[PDB]
Design a protein around this ligand. Sequence first.
Ligand SMILES: Cc1[nH]c(=O)n(C)c(=O)c1N
Length: 149
Amino acid sequence: ENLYFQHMKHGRVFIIKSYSEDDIHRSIKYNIWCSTEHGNKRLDAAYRSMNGKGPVYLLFSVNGSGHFCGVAEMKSAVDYNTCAGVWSQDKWKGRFDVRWIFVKDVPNSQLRHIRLENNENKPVTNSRDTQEVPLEKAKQVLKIIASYK
Ligand SMILES: Cc1[nH]c(=O)n(C)c(=O)c1N
């Protein structure tokens, strides 16, 4: 058995949906990310209210790709006034640090049975950017991602 993920109560988990394979590569290389304005606000609130008592996990997926591509932990609050144009589009403003802890393609077919009661019970694989995942579903997603071969 693996009871690792079932045994934790302080952590928050968000879906990250990116249009750009370049931005994913840049994020892995430099351990930084930037969301939209309302996305950044959502993640910043979650990070600051955690007060380092548990992780904020980010489950990354490229829009239309059919799979998740990895997992990162958020590692700073959002700095909203930073260099413009570092991402594939110049519409994203700011920067926060992440730490990629898992880089692996996980097909949507391995996760589409997990549904989000906070998103009309839609499959977790039909989420939009910065969709939050209830902890009990997040544990199941993390276990499937960690065990996929
Ligand atoms: C870096 C970045 N941040 C985002 O919020 N979205 C929605 C993207 O597509 C992307 N490439």
